[PDB]
């Protein structure tokens, strides 16, 4: 019923709404719940605050 997305910042506003609908429709497709109780929370994390292998996303080209 609640989908939380953690992801690096920089995606278009229209990519963000394309995701919200795409993930809702995954749950409603696969589990068969009603889109009404689906909540999609998108957490933009800045590239200075997201790390992979101990390195900020920024130093990684991200």
């Amino acid at each position: 019923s609640i989908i939380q997305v953690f992801f690096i910042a920089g995606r278009t506003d229209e990519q963000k709404e394309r995701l919200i609908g795409a993930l809702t429709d995954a749950a409603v497709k696969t589990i068969g719940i009603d889109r009404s109780d689906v909540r999609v929370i998108l957490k933009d994390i800045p590239n200075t605050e997201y790390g992979i292998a101990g390195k900020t996303a920024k130093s990684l080209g991200r």
């Binding site: 963000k16 709404e17 689906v38 933009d44």
Partner: protein, 59 residues
């Protein structure tokens, strides 16, 4: 006893800090927990990042 509230953007500074004591007293009250043990932090999600039935709050 830690609490995280996901709230869509647009709340007042007065009513956010107000939300914190409310949520804290509710746990003290229900589950008999000491005040100094409950931490409450509000997560402020933009209207284009909060989805309801596949749609954004913006829409």
């Amino acid at each position: 006893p830690n609490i995280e509230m996901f709230v869509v953007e647009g709340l007042s500074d007065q009513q956010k800090e107000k939300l914190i004591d409310a949520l804290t007293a509710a746990t003290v009250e229900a589950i008999d927990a000491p005040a100094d043990s409950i931490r409450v932090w509000l997560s402020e999600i933009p209207a284009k990042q909060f989805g309801i039935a596949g749609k954004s709050v913006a829409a």
